[PDB]
Amino acid sequence: SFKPTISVHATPQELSAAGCRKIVEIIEASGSQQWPLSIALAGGSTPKMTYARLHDEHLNLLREKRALRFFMGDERMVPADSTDSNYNMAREVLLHDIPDDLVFPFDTSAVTPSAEATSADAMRVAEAYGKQLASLLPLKSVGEAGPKVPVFDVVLLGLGSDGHTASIFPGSQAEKETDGKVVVSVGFPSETMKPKVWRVTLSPATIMQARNVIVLATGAEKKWVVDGILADTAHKAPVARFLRGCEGNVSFLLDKEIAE
Ligand SMILES: O=C(O)[C@H](O)[C@@H](O)[C@H](O)[C@H](O)COP(=O)(O)O
Ligand SMILES: [Zn+2]
């Protein structure tokens, strides 16, 4: 059934060290002929620290050595220089140093600060990204018969207290996109989550085809979420329970609390 790897870390500087260690280890295990490996980045302070660690400790591996091709697993429909942009964050801590031919943020260039984006806009950005992905990454039939989705080597994920991952929110349509017909979907945050802006996100089908999925999550308030992914039988399941269906390697980098 479901056996992900789980490791617990007392501090942020410890989990960030393991997150970055885990990526490097996947990078080395793959060897240079496989590079660049594709990785879908997540937003949030935990990954942020992991990025800064790669920036400080393995720039050479990524720049001179071109180990990874960076993508965004989910994004806020705001301008790229907005502080609410996942890319903005990623770029501030790491990507301003990564070759441009190895960085692929979402195209939010039509999003201005005068008019909030709608689902119409998010859908446009998603379709376009889906196209780039199919052109850049390997495609794989879903269920050996089904439609074609791109295969990432690595997807970094976060988890919210509403049990969502990436920008795939409870009750959402994105959440239902598991058959492969939709590679990048759309979604609006639930009540307890901010910023209140439309999102684009890798669908669950795309994520379940990734070769490695690494979830970093802290907080006692997110424990129900992990508990709910790991349970034998689904009961009042969080959205993230779909991760159970991941075809590749799943790992949880957890703090002491969310673990307990
Ligand atoms: O390390 C963090 O800060 C979390 O991983 C963080 O991302 C949060 O708990 C939710 O993910 C809400 O952000 P969203 O509403 O955009 O998903
Ligand atoms: Zn730098």
For the chain, the 3-state helix, strand and coil shares in percent, each to the nearest 5, are 40, 20, 40
Nearest CA to ligand 1 atom 17: 167
Q: Is the CB of 45 under 6 A from ligand 1?
A: yes
Alpha helix stretches (DSSP H) within 31-100: 45-57, 59-62, 86-93
User: Dihedrals φ, ψ of 170, to 5°?
Assistant: -50, 140
Which residues touch 155 (CB under 8 Å, ≥6 apart)?
A: 39, 40, 73, 202, 207, 210, 212, 213, 214
Sort strands 199-202 and 74-76 into parallel, antiparallel or unpaired: antiparallel
Q: Which ligand is located closest to the Cα atom of residue 96?
A: 2
In sequence order, the β-bridge partners of residue 198 are: none
Sort strands 5-9 and 68-72 into parallel, antiparallel or unpaired: unpaired
Alpha carbons 156 and 213: distance in angstroms, whole number: 6
Q: Is the CB of 180 under 6 A from ligand 1?
A: no
In sequence order, the β-bridge partners of residue 253 are: 7, 216
Domain 1-260 has CATH 3.40.50.720: no
The experimental method is X-ray
Alpha carbons 216 and 100: distance in angstroms, whole number: 26
Which residue, among 60, 49, 75, 251, has the nearest Cα to 154 in the 3D structure? 251
Hey, is 172 helix, strand or coil?
Answer: coil
Q: Is the CB of 187 under 6 A from ligand 1?
A: no
Token look-up 């490695």 returns: 212
Tokens found for residue 243: 């991760």
Q: Which ligand is located closest to the Cα atom of residue 16?
A: 1
**Ranges of each domain in the chain:** 1-260
C-alpha dist (Å) from residue 91 to 152, 196, 200: 20, 22, 18
Q: Is the CB of 44 under 6 A from ligand 1?
A: yes
